[PDB]
Structures are given as C-alpha cells and as structure tokens.
Design a protein around this nucleic acid. Structure first.
Ligand SMILES: [Mg+2]
Lengths: 158, 59, 51, 190, 42, 79, 245, 51, 107, 258
RNA sequence: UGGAAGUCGGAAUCCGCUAAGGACUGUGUAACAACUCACCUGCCGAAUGUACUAGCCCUGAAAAUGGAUGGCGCUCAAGCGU
C-alpha cells in the first residue's frame, strides 16, 4: 500500500531505458519488459529526446508519466530532422525557435518555476535556450533576454 | 610513410588521451572486423607463435 | 528471469554471434538464478530455442 | 617598538586556591594539587580583583607581550586540571592478530604500566611506564579502548603519545597495514 | 558550556581575543573624524 | 645537521694580503668600467626626476596643499 | 611582521560584495516602502531558515527582506528626522537579532493566521534543548540511526565512517560495513547522541543531521507591523516580550 | 603500474572462462567457487577487468 | 592481489584512524617547514631550492593575475594554412657581425 | 564544426549540418543535391541537402582532410555558360542546359555517378563512388611523401591532379586511382593546382613564389612563370582558358596570358 | 560516455530567488547521495589587509694534517650606525 516514486532519464521511443532499472525494480515485483513497454508508450511523443520519467508504484504495478523539462521542450520546439542516434553523434542544436514558443514553454514550466512573474520564467527559459545553443528569432537568446530586461520586448502577464 | 607513421599516430592520439587518469580512449584499434575473422586471426596467431617458439628453441 | 536488464532474445543472439569463437572449445550454458524463475516456467518456444 | 604596559587576566573558580611565589605557581582544587615553575618568563603577577589574577609586562617587546598569552593558557589549563581533570580515550584496532593490553600499577614507583602484546603477531612485549598522576583503565562500555585520566594535561597527553608511538608499523605499506593504538577522544573527566 | 567545535580538538582552550598590543591608543570617534579628513585630503 | 657534536673545518676570517690586494684592484677596475659604461649608456633618462610628493601621514598636508594653491594663485595674479 | 599567516587567494567566481550590496539593499527597501499597505517585522531565532524560500514562494504578492539588521534599520530610518514614512521609525525598535521585513497588501489577520498555521519539522541548531534521548543501537549502523526500523532502513554509507569517528562515535569498518562495536551487536553498548533536557552542542546537532533526525521546528514569530494608512505600529504577542533596540 | 597490477593468467593450463551479459551472476559464481576477491554489485559493468 | 586492490582495501577497511588528522597537521606545518628550508639548507641543494621556489612564485602570480583578469593569427594566411604550426616571422652591405675577437697564430 | 545552408533571398538558415568533431575544412555541392564535407576529424561526410540529413560517413583518413573535389566541379561552377557564349533565352532552357552539361560530365558507365576525391595530411588520397561503391573507397592514392594540400579532377574526367607538400604535383587515373607520372619542378610545397579547359595543361602555384604550367600528356614543364615576390596562395585558370590568375603574400594580383 | 547528476572529458557558462550562493573550489560515489569551499546572515568588538622600500640577521656551494676578526674571549657587546 506504500507508493514508491522513481525518477529516471529515458530516450523517447526506446526500450533500453529499463536495462538500468531492472536490478532494483526486480525485487520490487515489477516486470522489467512491461515497465519498458509503458515507458516507450509514454515517451512516444518525445522521439529521440532525453526526458525525465516518473514511475509511481502501487501494489506491484507502475504508472509511467513524463515530467516536462525546459531542455527537452526547447529541443522539441527546435523541430530538428529525425536521425539515428547510434550513427549521428556530436550534433548541435543551432536552429531557431520563436519567442512565442519560448513564452509557451515558460507557461508550461510555470508549475516548476519559483519566479514571481512570467517575465522571470521567460528569462529562465531563455537562459536554458542559451545553454542549449539555439537561436531565438534568429539572434542570441542572451541578447533577447537583455532586450527583455531593458524593456524593448514586452512579455505578457500570466 | 613508415618514416612518419609514428608521429602521425601521436598527433592523432596523444599519450595522455590514450592511457592514464585523463584518458578518453574507448574503442581499441583492431586488425579484424567480424567474429569469423577474429577466429581465423587467433588461429594464425597461435600458429605463428608456435613457429617462433620452435625456431627460437632450434636456434 | 531477465532481472539482468537484458532480454533473452539478446542473450541468445549474443551466444549465436560469439559461437564461431567457440570452435575447438567446450561450451556450457549455465542458466543462473533458479531461485527467481525456473526453466519449466518459461513460455515453451523459449525452451525449444534454448534446446 | 617597546610597549609600556601589557596585561592579561585569569579568572579563578571559587573552589580553587592559587599561590604564586617567585613565579612558582601552585594550583589546588577538589581533584588535587598541581605545580609549575614559570621563572623562565618575565612577568609580574598580582591580584587585580577578587577571583582574578593579573599578569603584566612592563617595557616589553612584542615577543615579551605575546609570552603572557602562553602563561595565561598554562595557568588556565592547570586550573581546569584541578577542577574537572583531563581524559584521553584511545582505541586499539587490528586486522588479524588481537592486540593484548595489560594495565598494572607498580607499587614501588606508584606509576601505571601498560604492556602491549601480539602487535601484528610480534613476540616482543612492549612496556610503557605512565607519567605520575596518570591513571589508566581498560574501558568496559566500549570495545578495545583505553582511558587515561589525570590532573596534568601535559602528562596525560604525553603518556597517550608514548602509547601511540610505541606501536609503530615499520617497513610495511601503511595503506594496507592499519594496526595501531590511536587517541580517539580528548576531553574533561567531569 | 561551549556550543562550537574547535578544529584541533583542544576543547579546553579559552575563547581567545585578538592580539592587538596597540589597542586603546586611539578612540573610535577620533579615527572616524580622521578617516573623513584623510578622504577629503586625498 | 650534526654541527654541534661534530663540527667541521672552520672557515677562516683571517684575510691574506694577496686576496686583499686582488679585491682592491678588482673593485677599482669595476669602478672605472662602470664609469665608462655610464658614459656610453644609451638608456633613456628623464630631464626632471619624479617627485615622491608629500607623505599622507603628515598631519598638515592639507594645509600645505592650501598654501601651495594660494601661492600659485598669487603667482598667476602677479604674472 | 615577517611571520604571518599566508592569506589564501580564492580562485572562485564569486567575489566579496562590499558597499554596493548595502546601497542596493537600501534602494530596494526604500522603493518597496511606498508600494505596500503594511510592513511586518518577523523573527526566526536560532533556526535554519532555509524554509524562507518556500515562504517567499507562497507569499508571491508580498515582498520579504532578510538582510543585515542594522542596514534594514537604517533603510527604514531609526529617527523621525530620517524615517522614510510617517511613524515608520517606531517599527525599527523591533530590529534586533535575526529578523526580517515583510511588505504586504494582505489582511494582517490573514498574515497572522498563515504564520500561526505554518509548521515544519527542522534540524536543531546548537543551543537548543533536546526533547528526547537519541541512541544509536549496537551493531550495524544504519542511515537513520535506528529511528526507523532496521528492516526498512538501509546501511549507512561507508564514506561517513571517518566523520562519525571525528564526531565521537566509536565506529569501525567491518568488510565494507560501518559497525558500532561488533557486527552482531556485541562487546559494546549503544551510543547516546543526546539525553533529554540536555542543551545540544554543534557536534551533537551535526550527528543528528547526519542521521536525519529532526528534534526542532521552523517557526516564524511576528513581532509587530506598521500600517501606511494610519501611520501607526501595532505590537503583537512575540514583540511584547522580545527585547528591543 | 597497470602491468604490475595485472593478474597472472596461464594460457596453457586448465581454465574455466566465465562469460555472458552483465548482471547475470558471473562474479557471484567465481566468488562461490574460488578465493578471488571480485566485487558483486547489482549495477552493470561492476567487473571492468579480468579476474 | 589483482587490479585496484589498494583502492578495494580502502573501500572495505578504510585507512589508519589518525590519517586525516596527521595529514591536516602536516599541511599546517608546511609553512614553518618551508621557511626552515629557506633559512637552513646549504650549498647546491639550497640554490636549486631557491630557483624552484622562484619558479613557483612566478607561476602563482601569473595564475592570480589571470583570475583577476577573467572578467574582461597575426599574418593573414589562407584557410588551408589555418590552425597549423606557422613560424612567428618576427646601400650599406654590412654583415651582422662585422668585428670579432682576433685569433693569434699561437692560439 | 558545422555547415550552414542559407537562402540567398532572405538571408536565413534553412539547415545546419552538424556532427563533425573538428573544423569543416571543405564543402562541395554536387549536382544531385548532395553536400560533401571534409573535416579535421579525419572524416568525409555526404549529406542530403533537401532534408538536411546525413547519408554517408567515411572514416578512412588518418589525419586532417584538407580538400575534397568532385568529378563535376568544372561544369557545376559555370552552369549553362560554355564555349558558345550565347546563353539560352529563358530560365527553363538555361536550367536544362546546365543539367545536361552536369549529366554529361558526371556519367559513369551510362548512369550519373559523381566521383569524389579527398586529400589528407596522412600523405594519401581516397577516391570514392557513393552511388555504386557506397562506403567502400574506389581507391587509395599513394605516393606523396608529405601532406597533400590540393586535388582536382580534370574537366574531361580522365585525370586527377594533386599538389602536395613534398614539392610535387602528381597525376592519377580518375577511374581506378592508379599513379601515372610525377611533375617535379618545384622546390617548395605546392599549394594550388588548376586545370585548363581542354585538360592538356595544369598550372601549379607554390611556396617558392612561382607558377608552373605542365603538359600532362608529355608529363613535362611547358612554362615557367616567375615574378611573384613572395609565396603564392591562390591560383585560378579561367573557364575559356584565356587567363591564369595568381595571388599571394606580395599583395598584388598577377594575370598571365599566352 | 558502458556508466558521468557542479567535481574523467570537449565547449558554453544564462536566468530566477535573492541576504547570498560558481551551470561550481576540493573530498567522495560505478552513477547518485553525503561533506566542503567561494559568497551571505547571526554572535563578538576596534583596528586591520595587500604589495613594495630601507636597516640588521639566515640561505645564496664546500673539499681533503689541527687553527685562527693576531690570540683570549665578547651578546642592553668587547658587534653595527651616528
Ligand atoms: Mg553486476
């Protein structure tokens, strides 16, 4: 009757995420192949992306959900061409994502943000996009964040 | 080519990246590609090793 | 029992892949962890493939 | 630069009697009596207040001013020794050969003696004679533990240091061979 | 009793004061006024 | 080192006449050589040396600066 | 003085703040003064105060200042000549010790009810009185020190053994396991971290924090608040008894 | 240093070579039948060298 | 023993009980020891010690200056010559050395 | 370590080809919308330009890839311009003529197959046919005693010229990658080579401040061109063969005529 | 990357909450955890910190019979400066 919460990192559309999960969920009474099947089914909307997966265990069955992260949301919004990760390595996320999608990602991530306003959330998402290495409106996300701080760009409230 | 192969190998992979506390080498350089080639290579390697031992004993 | 984190498909495929190395050698497949799952509990075309 | 006047103070508890004569300090408390000769240090002792000892140096250099701090700590440690006492707890650990510790008291000299046997299987018997005023007991609350107690902190700590230094591994890798006797705790008896 | 730990473990050591042999030659207010005058001069 | 128990051969401070005369000759030759090098020195030297100024710890430095200011004002007014 | 301690130059990113941080705190407090109806003064004495982040997140419509006490007093204005608002200098008498400011537009009754209902279990700091006796049992040392049952507990990490020895527990390393005495709970009594009614010291509180045992609580005590409309300061129960300066 | 810490393996003696996927019990079997101190852990690639 | 057996022994048994305290006390005594070495070593050993400490002081000053300044090719070449080890590259018909010491026939 | 594709009208990036671990030293755009990249991570990559995706990854070179050349480079640089000098009237006929010239240059055994050559610092070259051979090289060109700096197909597709750092230009058969003859007149590393339009002559510009015109059928030094005061960095031969341009460290453009 | 969560590496190194807290200074883990430093607050309480300069002192290289400020010896000098 005790709920067990396990957080893991998984790639979407793959069954190999349970390989490191099986030695601990085996004694817990879970079927590793079934758990990998539910993980792939939950992460089918995040193909080729590293996502955070939450497993809630109650009476020897696992509920599988995807916890949204800013990095995964930005890389998904970049709309990169599909590729084979075994053969296409050392890739860069150098495409562009518009400020409207940045604000939408901030609205999605409002449940995690401790900022007082959506402007602060947007600046956090712009910093994450700067870390990823993409462009916002064809320019640097640091430059857009500087313009937002200076007041040239207006961010909607809530 | 053989006169420059050593410096070419060291320029490609430095000694600190090959072995040591900061080494980044993960894949070895192999003279075989398939399992059947590996089995054949092991057979001829054992034969050549035995031939070298026999010629050293005879010498 | 596949608590190692890998499928029995993958284990049998790895054995078949490294089988050419086993020429002129003696091969024993040891099925471990019988305290978790026995061989008779397997869904029987797996038993057939192991045979 | 010479400093005209420098001063330190030592509080004295109500159950402590301090007598200073020609820079010889005698401290008496509930636990006993300690003595120390401080005639190697130039200092004027006085009674600035009830229960307060004053120490001063006139026309001294920076070194002479600084030496009063050492004198203050020495006298304070004697006061603490006659009030609460000092206790060092040591632990002896081993890998394969159990270290045997025997504690006796010599009636002729009044000093305790510690005998250490089977230190990494050695056949020699190590003998440490303790400083006078240092009581040694084998602990019953914990495993493989010695307790050293006394009024003189210097005597107790030097006795513990002698016990630690007599059990020294030689010509072996000290990453691998971990046997020895080590000071595990320092504090007051009370 | 003492509430903090001493790093070397000698817990009987008193709470020492800073070694300032020139302490008491100048008051605080005079030093403040001298600070302002020196800043203006500089 | 074991200097106290087993001291070594002492280092003599008694000078010899030969070494004293040699050192005096070398000092004189070094002085003449340094004078020649200063004559032929191509390093740049300022016409006016840099002044250290007035020390900060001098308690009447501000009054001295005031006196300098009034003196230069009077000099500019007279000239 | 040729003989001196060598000063370590830190090769880290963050530098010392200086007077710029003080001026920034002054400007922030003085600019947040006119935007709010009430200014509460609260105290958190001998507490870990890391839950003030959660308090800040919950009171997103309010502003919280937790700064240097004298700097916040000077920002408010300790005298009627230097006060930033009418009657604000009366609030500065509460600014002693570990205190903070809370600018709000909410109801003072709502603020008082929220801070009366706010409760959290926290690790004790040095100086608090121990509410109960804590004893680590002999044998294998577990991660919670015997608070939870050892069947549901996990063995403690082997990297904590020198720290436990340094904090005074006579533990030893037996085949990768930290043990108090023997592996089977023999030849040694249990280790008493603290006794009931004993004033805790920092070694004991560090041991309790390492074993994840909470013997104290986080409680914010409101001392009094100044209202901008009336210009007056209302005293509360904690401010009635707390020393003032 | 690595060569000095290398294990001594005789290629021309009676040898039992234990192989397979990670986390299947190879080190547990070698510990159970020999005196070698090869670690046993639930995570993959616990054994990174020949024992 | 085989592979990383000293690390495994550290993991299973730890170190000697006084290892951390002795290491900390030695690192604390390092300053007195360095001053004693500077004032008490003799001869060629002292000369090499002084040279080596001069080197450490210069390197430490350079590192401190670089960390202080943390918050702040030459000749044009084609693209195929980029990232290669290129040389720095820095009437009276007089030679660079017009006069040298004359060598007598006896020498 | 990237290649960016730009739309010239709008100035924005359509695709970013990434995956190289070193600097992309050379890029080529073939006539079937395949982009070829040679990098300092010892790799030669083929990309589908329409999708912006990776198609081929060749990892045969042992050192930096310096230059890559396509068998259709000469006609792809000039599009519909040719010897006639009357352009077609409309865009459709101009595009048809350009595609016809490309297919005529790139046909191998009756089918269009662009051939690729890569010259590297490992003293070698690799000849590739991605369409027919795929990841297997057609040949490895061996014989340079130092780094190969530049490589170029002849306009008729029968020869390959290569300029190396061993003061030598070498000639190879473009079909099987077999050595033919060594051109030996330079005394410093040869940086650039350029073919004439009729594939009889190749001009080489070297570090010894000279250009040299070679007759490839006799394998001899036809013309010596001195006059550059310092090193020669860039050499081009015009498509109609009237002029050779050279430039380098002496800052002056030199044009050479018959 | 088999694994790599500030701390095996390559490159970036931004924002929020801030009183302040590096996309991290070290210890540590297989990877996490845990500890620690930079930085901040409370206690305390009055002067300090850094770098240079000038004096005197130590080191700044020595062989080989036993010896030399001339010798005794000299330490608020019987040494050094006026
Ligand atoms: Mg395992």
């Amino acid at each position: 009757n005790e709920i067990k919460i396990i957080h893991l990192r998984a790639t979407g559309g793959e069954v190999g995420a349970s390989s490191a999960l099986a030695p601990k969920i085996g004694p817990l009474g879970l079927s590793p192949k079934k758990v990998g099947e539910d993980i792939a089914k939950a992460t089918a909307d995040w193909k080729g992306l590293r996502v955070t997966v939450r497993l809630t265990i109650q009476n020897r069955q696992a509920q599988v959900s995807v916890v949204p992260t800013a990095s995964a949301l930005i890389i998904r919004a970049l709309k990169e061409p599909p590729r084979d990760r075994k053969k296409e390595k050392n890739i860069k996320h150098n495409k562009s994502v518009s400020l409207d999608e940045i604000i939408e990602i901030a609205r999605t991530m409002r449940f995690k943000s401790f900022s007082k306003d959506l402007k602060g959330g947007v600046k956090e998402i712009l910093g994450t996009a700067f870390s990823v290495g993409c462009q916002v409106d064809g320019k640097s996300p640091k430059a857009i964040s500087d313009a937002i701080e200076a007041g040239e760009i207006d961010i909607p409230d809530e | 080519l053989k006169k420059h192969q050593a410096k070419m190998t060291i320029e490609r992979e430095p000694f600190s990246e090959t072995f040591g506390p900061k080494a980044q080498r993960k894949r070895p350089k192999l003279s075989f590609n398939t399992v059947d080639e590996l089995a054949g290579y092991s057979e001829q390697s054992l034969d050549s090793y035995h031939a070298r031992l026999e010629e050293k004993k005879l010498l | 029992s596949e608590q190692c984190g890998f499928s029995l498909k993958a284990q049998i495929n790895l054995f078949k892949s490294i089988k050419p190395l086993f020429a002129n050698k003696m091969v024993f497949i040891v099925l471990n962890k019988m305290d978790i799952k026995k061989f008779e509990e397997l869904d029987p075309e797996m038993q057939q493939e192991i045979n | 630069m010479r400093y005209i006047h420098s001063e330190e103070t030592i509080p004295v508890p109500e159950n402590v009697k301090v007598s200073i004569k020609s820079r010889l300090v005698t401290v008496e408390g509930p636990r006993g009596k300690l003595q120390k000769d401080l005639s190697h240090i130039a200092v004027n002792f006085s009674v600035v207040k009830k229960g307060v000892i004053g120490l001063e140096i006139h026309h001294g250099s920076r070194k002479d001013v600084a030496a009063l701090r050492t004198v203050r700590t020495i006298i304070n440690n004697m006061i603490i020794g006659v009030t609460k006492g000092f206790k060092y707890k040591m632990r002896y650990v081993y890998a394969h050969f159990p270290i045997n510790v025997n504690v006796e008291k010599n009636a002729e000299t009044g000093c305790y003696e510690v005998e250490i046997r089977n230190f990494i299987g050695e056949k020699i018997v190590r003998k440490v004679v303790m400083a006078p005023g240092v009581e040694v007991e084998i602990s019953k609350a914990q495993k493989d533990e010695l307790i050293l107690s006394g009024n003189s902190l210097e005597a107790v700590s030097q006795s513990a240091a002698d016990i630690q230094q007599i059990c020294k591994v030689r010509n072996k890798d000290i990453r691998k061979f971990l046997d020895g006797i080590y000071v595990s705790e320092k504090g007051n008896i009370v | 009793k003492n509430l903090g730990m001493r790093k070397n473990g000698q817990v009987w050591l008193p709470a020492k004061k800073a070694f300032r042999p020139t302490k008491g030659l100048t008051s605080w207010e005079l030093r403040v006024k001298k600070r302002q005058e020196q800043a203006a001069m500089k | 080192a074991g200097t106290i128990n087993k001291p070594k051969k002492p280092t003599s401070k008694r000078k010899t006449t030969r070494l004293r005369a040699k050192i005096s000759k070398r000092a004189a030759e070094k002085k003449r050589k340094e004078r020649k090098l200063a004559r032929k020195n191509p390093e740049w030297r300022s016409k006016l040396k840099k002044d250290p100024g007035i020390p900060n710890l001098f308690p009447y430095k501000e009054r001295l600066l005031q006196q300098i200011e009034e003196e230069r004002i009077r000099r500019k007014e007279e000239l | 003085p040729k003989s001196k301690r060598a000063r370590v130059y830190h090769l880290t990113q963050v530098n010392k703040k200086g007077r710029e941080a003080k001026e920034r705190l002054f400007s922030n407090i003085r600019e947040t003064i006119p935007k709010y109806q009430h200014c509460f003064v609260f105290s958190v004495d001998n507490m870990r105060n890391n839950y003030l982040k959660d308090v800040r997140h919950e009171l997103n419509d309010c502003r919280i200042f937790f700064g240097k006490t004298k700097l916040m007093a000077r920002a408010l204005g300790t005298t009627p000549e230097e006060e930033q608002a009418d009657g604000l200098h009366r609030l500065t008498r509460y600014l002693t010790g570990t205190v903070g400011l809370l600018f709000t537009n909410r109801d003072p009754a709502d603020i008082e009810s929220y801070f009366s209902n706010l409760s959290q279990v926290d690790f004790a700091r040095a100086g608090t009185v121990a509410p109960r006796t804590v004893t680590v049992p002999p044998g294998i040392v577990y991660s919670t020190g015997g608070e939870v049952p050892p069947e549901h507990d996990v063995p403690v990490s082997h990297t904590l053994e020198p720290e436990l020895r340094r904090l005074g527990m006579p533990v030893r390393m037996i085949k990768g396991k930290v043990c108090l005495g023997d592996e089977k709970g023999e030849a040694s009594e249990g280790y008493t971290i603290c006794k009931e009614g004993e004033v805790l010291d920092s070694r004991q509180t560090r041991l309790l924090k390492l074993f994840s045992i909470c013997l104290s609580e986080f409680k914010v005590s409101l001392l009094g608040y100044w209202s901008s409309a009336s210009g007056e300061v209302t005293e509360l129960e904690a401010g009635k008894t707390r020393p003032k300066r | 240093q690595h060569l000095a810490r290398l294990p001594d393996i005789n290629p021309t003696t009676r040898t039992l070579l234990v192989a397979g996927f990670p986390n299947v019990g190879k080190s547990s079997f070698v510990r159970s039948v020999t005196r070698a101190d090869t670690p046993v852990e639930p995570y993959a690639f616990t054994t990174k060298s020949l024992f | 023993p085989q592979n990383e057996y000293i690390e495994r022994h550290r993991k299973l048994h730890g170190r000697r009980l006084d290892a951390e305290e002795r290491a900390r006390k030695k690192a604390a005594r390092e300053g007195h020891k360095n001053s004693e070495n500077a004032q008490n070593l003799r001869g060629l050993r002292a000369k090499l010690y002084a040279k080596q400490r001069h080197a450490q002081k210069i390197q430490m000053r350079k590192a401190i200056k670089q960390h202080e300044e943390r918050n702040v090719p030459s000749d044009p070449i084609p693209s195929y010559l980029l990232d290669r080890a290129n040389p720095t590259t820095a009437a009276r018909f007089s030679v660079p050395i017009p006069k040298v010491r004359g060598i007598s026939e006896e020498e | 370590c990237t290649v960016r594709i730009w739309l010239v009208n709008t100035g924005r990036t359509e695709h970013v080809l990434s995956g190289h671990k070193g600097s992309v030293s050379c890029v080529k755009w073939g006539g079937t919308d395949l982009i070829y990249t040679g990098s300092h991570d010892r790799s030669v990559r083929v990309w589908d330009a329409v999708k912006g995706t990776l198609v081929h990854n060749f990892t045969a070179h042992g050192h930096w890839v310096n230059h890559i050349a396509l068998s259709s480079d000469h006609v792809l640089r000039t599009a519909y311009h040719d010897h006639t000098k009357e352009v077609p009237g409309t865009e459709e006929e101009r595009r048809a003529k350009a595609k016809e010239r490309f297919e005529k240059a790139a046909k191998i055994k009756g089918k269009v197959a662009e051939r690729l050559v890569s010259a590297s610092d490992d003293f070698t070259m690799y000849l590739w046919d991605p369409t027919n051979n795929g990841s297997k090289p057609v040949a490895r060109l061996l014989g340079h005693q130092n780094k190969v700096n530049h490589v170029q197909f002849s306009p008729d597709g029968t020869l390959i010229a290569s300029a190396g750092w061993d003061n030598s230009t070498k000639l190879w058969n473009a079909r099987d990658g077999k050595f033919i003859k060594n051109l030996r007149g330079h005394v410093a590393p040869v940086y650039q080579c350029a073919w004439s339009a009729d594939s009889r002559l190749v001009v080489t510009g070297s570090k010894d401040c000279t250009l040299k015109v070679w007759n490839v059928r006799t394998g001899k030094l036809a013309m010596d061109l001195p006059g550059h005061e310092d090193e020669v960095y860039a050499v081009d031969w015009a498509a109609d063969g009237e002029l050779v341009a050279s430039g380098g460290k002496d800052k002056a453009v030199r044009t050479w005529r018959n």
